[PDB]
Every structure is written in structure tokens, then in C-alpha cells.
Design a protein around this motif. Sequence first.
Motif, PDB file in Angstrom:
ATOM      1  N   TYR A  20       0.813  -1.216   0.000  1.00 11.45           N
ATOM      2  CA  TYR A  20       0.000   0.000   0.000  1.00 11.45           C
ATOM      3  C   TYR A  20       0.851   1.273   0.000  1.00 11.45           C
ATOM      4  CZ  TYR A  20      -4.201   2.684   1.577  1.00 11.45           C
ATOM      5  OH  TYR A  20      -5.236   3.575   1.718  1.00 11.45           O
ATOM      6  N   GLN A  48      -2.746   5.580  -2.057  1.00 14.05           N
ATOM      7  CA  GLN A  48      -3.479   6.610  -1.329  1.00 14.05           C
ATOM      8  C   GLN A  48      -2.934   7.991  -1.662  1.00 14.05           C
ATOM      9  OE1 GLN A  48      -3.390   8.258   3.150  1.00 14.05           O
ATOM     10  NE2 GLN A  48      -4.052   6.112   3.071  1.00 14.05           N
ATOM     11  N   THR A 147       9.544   7.163  12.361  1.00 11.68           N
ATOM     12  CA  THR A 147       9.292   7.845  11.101  1.00 11.68           C
ATOM     13  C   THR A 147       9.137   9.347  11.318  1.00 11.68           C
ATOM     14  OG1 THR A 147       7.667   8.131   9.321  1.00 11.68           O
ATOM     15  CG2 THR A 147       6.867   7.253  11.429  1.00 11.68           C
ATOM     16  N   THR A 149       8.211  11.274   8.376  1.00  7.63           N
ATOM     17  CA  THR A 149       7.432  11.699   7.215  1.00  7.63           C
ATOM     18  C   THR A 149       6.189  12.455   7.668  1.00  7.63           C
ATOM     19  OG1 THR A 149       8.220   9.768   5.997  1.00  7.63           O
ATOM     20  CG2 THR A 149       6.306  10.932   5.104  1.00  7.63           C
ATOM     21  N   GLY A 179       7.694   3.937   9.034  1.00  2.00           N
ATOM     22  CA  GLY A 179       9.097   3.567   8.909  1.00  2.00           C
ATOM     23  C   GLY A 179       9.364   2.191   8.332  1.00  2.00           C
ATOM     24  N   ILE A 199       5.620   5.337   2.609  1.00  2.00           N
ATOM     25  CA  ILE A 199       5.734   6.542   1.811  1.00  2.00           C
ATOM     26  C   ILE A 199       7.178   6.632   1.328  1.00  2.00           C
ATOM     27  CG2 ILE A 199       5.645   9.068   1.713  1.00  2.00           C
ATOM     28  CD1 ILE A 199       3.436   9.082   3.703  1.00  2.00           C
ATOM     29  N   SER A 200       8.075   7.093   2.200  1.00  2.00           N
ATOM     30  CA  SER A 200       9.482   7.297   1.837  1.00  2.00           C
ATOM     31  C   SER A 200      10.296   6.122   1.296  1.00  2.00           C
ATOM     32  CB  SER A 200      10.239   7.938   3.011  1.00  2.00           C
ATOM     33  OG  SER A 200      10.336   7.061   4.121  1.00  2.00           O
TER      34      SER A 200
HETATM   35  C1  LIG Z   1       0.727   8.776   6.710  1.00  2.00           C
HETATM   36  C2  LIG Z   1       1.130   8.105   8.008  1.00  2.00           C
HETATM   37  C3  LIG Z   1       2.426   7.774   8.360  1.00  2.00           C
HETATM   38  C4  LIG Z   1       3.681   8.012   7.522  1.00  2.00           C
HETATM   39  C5  LIG Z   1       4.415   6.851   6.918  1.00  2.00           C
HETATM   40  O1  LIG Z   1       5.568   7.398   6.215  1.00  2.00           O
HETATM   41  P1  LIG Z   1       6.910   6.537   6.027  1.00  2.00           P
HETATM   42  O2  LIG Z   1       7.818   7.322   5.167  1.00  2.00           O
HETATM   43  O3  LIG Z   1       6.491   5.225   5.224  1.00  2.00           O
HETATM   44  O4  LIG Z   1       7.351   6.257   7.428  1.00  2.00           O
HETATM   45  S1  LIG Z   1       2.479   7.022   9.929  1.00  2.00           S
HETATM   46  C6  LIG Z   1       0.812   7.174  10.049  1.00  2.00           C
HETATM   47  N1  LIG Z   1       0.221   7.752   8.985  1.00  2.00           N
HETATM   48  C7  LIG Z   1      -1.358   7.891   8.862  1.00  2.00           C
HETATM   49  C8  LIG Z   1      -1.881   6.728   8.027  1.00  2.00           C
HETATM   50  C9  LIG Z   1      -1.876   5.459   8.552  1.00  2.00           C
HETATM   51  N2  LIG Z   1      -2.303   4.373   7.836  1.00  2.00           N
HETATM   52  C10 LIG Z   1      -2.752   4.561   6.543  1.00  2.00           C
HETATM   53  C11 LIG Z   1      -3.142   3.365   5.809  1.00  2.00           C
HETATM   54  F1  LIG Z   1      -3.805   2.530   6.574  1.00  2.00           F
HETATM   55  F2  LIG Z   1      -3.849   3.681   4.741  1.00  2.00           F
HETATM   56  F3  LIG Z   1      -2.051   2.736   5.392  1.00  2.00           F
HETATM   57  N3  LIG Z   1      -2.807   5.750   5.964  1.00  2.00           N
HETATM   58  C12 LIG Z   1      -2.389   6.863   6.663  1.00  2.00           C
HETATM   59  N4  LIG Z   1      -2.457   8.030   6.035  1.00  2.00           N
END
Ligand SMILES: Cc1c(CCOP(=O)([O-])[O-])sc[n+]1Cc1cnc(C(F)(F)F)nc1N
Length: 226
Positions: A20, A48, A147, A149, A179, A199-200
Motif C-alpha cells: 500500500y 493513497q 518515522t 514523514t 518507517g 511513503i518514503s
Molecule cells: C501517513 C502516516 C504515516 C507516515 C508513513 O511514512 P513513512 O515514510 O512510510 O514512514 S504514519 C501514520 N500515517 C497515517 C496513516 C496510517 N495508515 C494509513 C493506511 F492505513 F492507509 F495505510 N494511511 C495513513 N495516512
Amino acid sequence: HGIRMTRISREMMKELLSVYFIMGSNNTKADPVTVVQKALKGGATLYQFREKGGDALTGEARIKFAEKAQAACREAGVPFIVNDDVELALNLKADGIHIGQEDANAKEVRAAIGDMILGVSAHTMSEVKQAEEDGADYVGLGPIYPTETKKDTRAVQGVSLIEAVRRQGISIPIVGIGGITIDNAAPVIQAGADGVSMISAISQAEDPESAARKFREEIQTYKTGR
Ligand SMILES: Cc1c(CCOP(=O)([O-])[O-])sc[n+]1Cc1cnc(C(F)(F)F)nc1N
Ligand SMILES: [Mg+2]
């Protein structure tokens, strides 16, 4: 994925959560839509649209970006989920909407979107139970790992909540987030999650297509192994 006339099945929802990918224009230094296209080509199973915070696009520019990302999802045959913005999700005929504890109430949202996909961010057992009661199709649990982000995140919880939820007999679709990288994703699936969200790890990868492909291969292997 067309207009739904029935709630999505748990089997299908769990398949979609595998890899996802979440992204906004401010999460990458490359061209936003190009990165989304590469992530989808690599194997992301759900996307998303999350455009918020400082530097993020607004107004008509934001809507146009959303349309292009939705078109990319259409070409890849992947569902398009909108974060926070219920009105935008309805206007674009998105496949779903994701909301958090500080956003519109899940009951309110479920009533406004019909049979569209509904995801809810949860951090405690009570919130997970409330989300299911409100009509959520899946819950996003985290942050699993550190994380930055998203600035306003709750305490890091590892896979503790995922295990606790499954131990209580709750079979609602779960996706772990926070993360997550290709090196630490396995434990999330082994704990009982139906997929990982990031995300990242993909948006800032030198090769987003390859990163998404690695995730896809890895997650399939661990879902079969647990
Ligand atoms: C957007 C986000 C994070 C950031 C992740 O960034 P990374 O760079 O991968 O650490 S940590 C918690 N959230 C809220 C969130 C949680 N879970 C989902 C799901 F359920 F749709 F997945 N979508 C979201 N928008
Ligand atoms: Mg939110």
C-alpha cells in the motif's frame, strides 16, 4: 474496480493491502506523478493520495494532481484511495477514503460514501474496535517503526497492537505503517498484518519501480509462509 454496489469482501481487501503506497507531491524530489506510475508498475497493490502540510499543493492545482494520479491507478488496474478529504473522494469517484482519529467521524463518513472502501487509522485496542463497529473496511496500525514523514505521530509500537488484535480474535483487514522498509517488513506480516504501507521507502528511492517490486515479492512470500 468500478462503482461498488456492495461492501468489499475481507478476502479482496486483504489482498489489496499487500503493498500500500501512499504519497503526496512533498514526499519526493522527483516528478510526483512519475513516481506514482513507477510504484504501480513495480507492483504496488493500492495507492493513497495524501496531499497535505507545508509545501503541498492546494486548490485547483491539488485537484488536477489528484486526477492525474487517479488516471495512473486506472491504467495499472489499482484502486485509488483519498486521504482525509471526503468531498474530493466523492467528486473524483475515488475507490475509497482513509481517515484518522482527528478527522471526520467514521460513522459520519461511512454514511456519506455508500459502499466505497473505508480505512481508519488506529493506535489502541479501543480505537480498532470502534473502527470496526463504525463500518471501516480496514485499519492502519502504527507507527510500527520510527518515522519523520508525518510529524504528528503517536508513540512507536512495533507489532504489539497487531498481535494483540489478532489474539483477541479480531479478523478485520490490517495494514501496518510507519518507517517500513524492505528490510523490516517481514515481521509486520508475520505478526498478523495483511500488508504494509509506506511513503518514503518508495517515494524517495533512487529506483521506485524496483523498490515496489521487491516489496511485492517479499510480502507474497511471507503471507504464504504465515
Ligand atoms: C501517513 C502516516 C504515516 C507516515 C508513513 O511514512 P513513512 O515514510 O512510510 O514512514 S504514519 C501514520 N500515517 C497515517 C496513516 C496510517 N495508515 C494509513 C493506511 F492505513 F492507509 F495505510 N494511511 C495513513 N495516512
Ligand atoms: Mg487524517
